[PDB]
């Protein structure tokens, strides 16, 4: 079986980022095993859009994209595709047009190479004010992109109510760019979230399963 295997290693080593700084791994030509990756964690929920868990690990794609980040299970309610929670409003949104999955899993004691952050952080509001008109335009994050407020919010929220702001250049209107941090206490076992987005090619699907 020739082909380079998909390298899921970067998520096993280090601290998984916060949800608004989700780490993105793209796979274009791979042999992959999702069961192999998931046997390492204690999966809590595994919900998909326009695909099912059995089919997502069983098919060939033209590209496979894996987002992972620290995410507590206490906020499972706000992490869905059709969601209206603050997460899928200003923190992390995945594509409409593509088949999609959303995984919550806890990292067990068998894994001591994934380090913990001090706390769970997410952006509860990010909005933009114009100079001449102070009408607030909430920067609803676009699919597969980062919040514009990643430029001003740090890697981890320090206190639950922290407030971040940046003044904009007169090119873009000269307004103010503003964000609010919000925090969740870290748990004894780190909890994470994974996003999967896949593209089927019209001609070639080279990211193929283990067999």
């Amino acid at each position, epitope marked *: 079986a020739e082909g380079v295997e998909c390298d899921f290693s970067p998520l096993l080593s280090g601290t998984p980022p916060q949800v608004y700084n989700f780490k993105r791994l793209v796979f274009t030509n791979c042999n992959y095993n999702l069961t192999k990756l998931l046997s390492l964690f204690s999966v809590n929920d595994f919900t998909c859009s326009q695909i099912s868990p059995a089919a997502i690990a069983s098919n060939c794609y033209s590209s496979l994209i894996l987002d992972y980040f620290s995410y507590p299970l206490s906020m499972k309610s706000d992490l869905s595709v059709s969601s209206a929670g603050p997460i899928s409003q200003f923190n992390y949104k995945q594509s409409f047009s593509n088949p999609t999955c959303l995984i919550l899993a806890t990292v067990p004691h068998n894994l001591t190479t994934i380090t913990k952050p001090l706390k769970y952080s997410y952006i509860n509001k990010c*909005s933009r*004010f114009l100079s001449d008109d*102070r009408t*607030e335009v909430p920067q609803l994050v676009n699919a597969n992109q980062y919040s514009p407020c990643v430029s*001003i*919010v*740090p890697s981890t929220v*320090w*206190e639950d*109510g*922290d*407030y*971040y*702001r*940046k*003044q904009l250049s007169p090119l873009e209107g000269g*307004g*103010w760019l*503003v*964000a*609010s*941090g919000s925090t969740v206490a870290m748990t004894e076992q780190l909890q994470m979230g994974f996003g999967i987005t896949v593209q089927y090619g019209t001609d070639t699907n080279s990211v193929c399963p283990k067999l």
Partner: nanobody
Amino acid sequence: VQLQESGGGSVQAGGSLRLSCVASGSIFSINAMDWYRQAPGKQRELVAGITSGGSTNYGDFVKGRFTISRDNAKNTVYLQMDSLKPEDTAVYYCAAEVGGWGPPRPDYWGHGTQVTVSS
């Protein structure tokens, strides 16, 4: 709640100066504190600001010359000003934002200290 300023005085052009604003305020619910200045007959304009989250932001006329800092341990904010020029002559105020969101609309102001610059 009260804001008090120190450090104001006359300084010749190109020199340095530091103002300080201790907030003996009833509340710690200030989420940003800002420095403004009012030059003889110009609009009161924003010079520098620091926030709850520590994001620093400055007025459009200081070319890295001014630097704002806060130590929450002493309830005080410093504004160190370098390479001053006569155009920086104004009465400087420090201000606090309670539940501030977006453009600075300060809810408490200080009595203002005056800085003058002669060339």
